[PDB]
Amino acid sequence: IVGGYTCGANTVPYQVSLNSGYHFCGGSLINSQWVVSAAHCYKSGIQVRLGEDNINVVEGNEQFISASKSIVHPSYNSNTLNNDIMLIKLKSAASLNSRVASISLPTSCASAGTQCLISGWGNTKSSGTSYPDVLKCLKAPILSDSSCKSAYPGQITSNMFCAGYLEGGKDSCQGDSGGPVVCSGKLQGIVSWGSGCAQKNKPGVYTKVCNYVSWIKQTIASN
Ligand SMILES: CC(=N)N1CCC(Oc2ccc([C@@H](Cc3ccc4ccc(C(=N)N)cc4c3)C(=O)O)cc2)CC1
Numbered sequence: 001i002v003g004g005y006t007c008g009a010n011t012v013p014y015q016v017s018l019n020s021g022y023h024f025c026g027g028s029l030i031n032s033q034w035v036v037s038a039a040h041c042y043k044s045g046i047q048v049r050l051g052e053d054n055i056n057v058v059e060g061n062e063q064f065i066s067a068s069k070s071i072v073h074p075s076y077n078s079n080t081l082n083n084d085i086m087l088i089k090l091k092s093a094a095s096l097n098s099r100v101a102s103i104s105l106p107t108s109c110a111s112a113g114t115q116c117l118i119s120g121w122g123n124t125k126s127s128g129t130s131y132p133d134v135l136k137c138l139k140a141p142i143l144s145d146s147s148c149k150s151a152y153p154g155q156i157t158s159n160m161f162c163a164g165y166l167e168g169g170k171d172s173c174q175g176d177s178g179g180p181v182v183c184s185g186k187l188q189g190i191v192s193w194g195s196g197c198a199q200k201n202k203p204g205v206y207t208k209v210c211n212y213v214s215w216i217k218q219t220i221a222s223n
């Protein structure tokens, strides 16, 4: 997260860290046994780490659970990043409490202007690389489809939305991928892509979760 702030230990209880010997992607806990992330985060040997703040020190409240199966959306396209969504089933159900809780799926899509909270352990620099120990947060509004498509001509599908600041300086970045975009207590987006990080006129692009509610529910029910 570039230009964000330190969230505060366990203040984003649904935030998950995907680990394979190091943090590589974020995710959101949607129930005691399922996590939603980005399809581009797919990898074998994924350990889901819940209740994390400092990802390098064991501070208490952490729950490490192996992924039993990762389900990449069947229509995911690695070049366009259309349908960039993946469901991860935990080997065992997480112990939900004050510091580890699930986030609700939306019943309707969010409109332009809606303020949302984006979080992650991704790169904190626009030019260069600097990964944080603790979780970073950023409040950003959903942009209009017009501005989104003007920024990324021919690359925005109906399953994507832009969020952020056109003036640059505040944005999600590499490492934040798969993480949550929560608006009014509902998970509306998943960190997907963008051109660089926190660049002028190049806001972040996110997977539009409201378009996948039926798919998520049907898939979870059959697995
Ligand atoms: C051809 C096309 N339709 N496109 C262009 C490529 C685009 O996908 C991608 C895929 C990867 C990349 C980056 C890596 C990267 C990864 C995660 C990111 C997460 C967030 C942000 C952001 N600025 N919000 C930027 C990121 C940049 C990189 O430079 O390797 C950039 C665009 C999909 C859309």
Ligand SMILES: [Ca+2]
Residues within 6 Å of the ligand: 054, 055, 056, 057, 058, 059
């Ligand atoms: Ca740690």
